[PDB]
Structure 1
Amino acid sequence: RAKAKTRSSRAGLQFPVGRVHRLLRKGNYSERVGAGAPVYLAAVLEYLTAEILE
């Protein structure tokens, strides 16, 4: 709680990297999410939303 830096900003991705972790965990997809997976899956959604929106 010393200072607040968004987990999206540290990896420089616009799409949320905190919300995708809760939705992967609370949908019962698997027992232990891991921490290299929320960040990879918030970048394969952002590239696709930047192909249809351009």
Structure 2
Amino acid sequence: AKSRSNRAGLQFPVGRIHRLLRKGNYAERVGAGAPVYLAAVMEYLAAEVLELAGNAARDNKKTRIIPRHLQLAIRNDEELNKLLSGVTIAQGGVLPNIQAVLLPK
């Protein structure tokens, strides 16, 4: 009766991942450990962007992480910015990007 998540010792629910694999109809024969791999990767990247989001919120010294903080946490990085390049962000904005000749004479 043991779930797979605590069996994997993780926090992403692999069973509904398997459910939306099966009814999502991408591969023919769904492997058992393949979503266990997948949701683990998802959990890692979720926590990874969450850490920089919390760092940005700590730089604003506030408790609630906001979409501004998400834009900061995606713009300060480059490889995460590589992965989420074309991703428009709701309430996104961008980092303060001041250029050279935009300064006055």
Q: How does 1:1-54 map to 2 (within 5 A)?
A: 4-54=1-51
Q: Which gives a bigger RCO, structure 1 or 2 (Cα 8 Å, sep 6+)?
A: 1
More helix by share: 2
Number of paired residues?
51
Structure 2 residue runs of 5 or longer lacking an equivalent are 52-105
Shift of 1:45: 0.1
| Cα distance in 2, alignment partners of residues 5 and 35 from structure 1 | 15
| Cα distance in 2, alignment partners of residues 15 and 36 from structure 1 | 14
Aligned residues: CA RMSD: 0.9
Percentage identity across paired residues of the two chains: 86
TM-score between the two structures when normalised by the length of structure 1: 0.85
Structure 1 residue runs of 5 or longer lacking an equivalent are none
